[PDB]
Design a binder for this molecule. Structure first.
Ligand code: 373
Length: 272
């Protein structure tokens, strides 16, 4: 009933992805802020249709909320949660990382989001710092479900075979096997994200035997560049996550039992 409540103004550009751009939209009356993903279909009906479907199913504090979508010819307008904190990528100092306590807390939030997604049967398939957003209170939110898919339906898991994601964050089995379990792949990418937060660098371009960096990790040369600056406890967790055999790689339930995962490190927000 209130007059101009449905009008939104596009204040600025949050980031222009490969397929389009994302803008910060402010409500004309209430001044509520939201992000609008703008994609030009004439450049894909199938992809965007799936992304919208998966987003409608999501409702969790560590997953970017989906408010709705507006047709408007061939310019899909996806209204999503606005995270003023930006990308986790920008909170990682090159070659340094960030304070261990912050990384632990961001890792906890990441696991909560992934447990939720996997619990509802969907795999993200492209977990990386650029898709992990921070809200005003620094709470992590998993975003961009353009590459996500359902791996469990009617309590029956389906193996994946499509190759997608981002090389540095991709699990080795995706490059070596024809079919693979969805869950271990997201676990692996979360491991590369943790390494990034603690070392401020990616360990390898891709998890292939041909990649020298990857071979050195499998040979346990932890005295080398990335691993040397991490620290015992979290390093032990990484050894369990970045395991080549996906069937031997640690699961999320066990990650929540890991020593570093449960180590008291960070206090609450200064002055409650
Ligand atoms: N003065 C203009 C600059 C432009 C770059 N900007 C960094 C920055 C701050 C907040 C910020 N929030 C985003 C978002 C992206 C995004 C992508 C996909 C789904 C939902 C959302 N929601 C967002 O919320 C991206 C981004 C990026 C700092 C201000």
């Amino acid at each position: 009933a209130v007059p101009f409540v449905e009008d939104w103004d596009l204040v600025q550009t949050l980031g222009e992805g490969a397929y389009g751009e994302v803008q910060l939209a402010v409500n004309r009356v209430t001044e509520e802020a939201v992000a609008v993903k703008i994609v030009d279909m004439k450049r894909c009906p199938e992809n965007i249709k799936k992304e919208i479907c998966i987003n409608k199913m999501l409702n969790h504090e560590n997953v970017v909320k989906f408010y709705g979508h507006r047709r408007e010819g061939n310019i899909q307008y996806l209204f999503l949660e606005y995270c003023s904190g930006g990308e986790l990528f920008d909170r990682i100092e090159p070659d340094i990382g960030m304070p261990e306590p912050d990384a632990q807390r961001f890792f906890h939030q990441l696991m909560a989001g992934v447990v939720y997604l996997h619990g509802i049967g969907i795999t993200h398939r492209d977990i990386k710092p650029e898709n992990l957003l921070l809200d005003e209170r620094d709470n992590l939110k998993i975003s961009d479900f353009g590459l996500a898919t359902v791996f469990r339906y009617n309590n029956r898991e389906r193996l994946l075979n499509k190759m997608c994601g981002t090389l540095p964050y991709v699990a080795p089995e995706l490059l070596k096997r024809r079919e693979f379990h969805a869950e271990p792949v997201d676990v692996w990418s979360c491991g590369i994200v943790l390494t990034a937060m603690l070392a401020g660098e990616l360990p390898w371009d891709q998890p292939s035997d041909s990649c020298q960096e990857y071979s050195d990790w499998k040979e346990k040369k932890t005295y080398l560049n990335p691993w040397k600056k991490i620290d015992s406890a979290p390093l032990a967790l990484l050894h369990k996550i970045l395991v080549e055999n996906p069937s031997a790689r640690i699961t999320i339930p066990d990650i929540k039992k890991d020593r570093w995962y449960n180590k008291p490190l960070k206090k609450g927000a200064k002055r409650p």
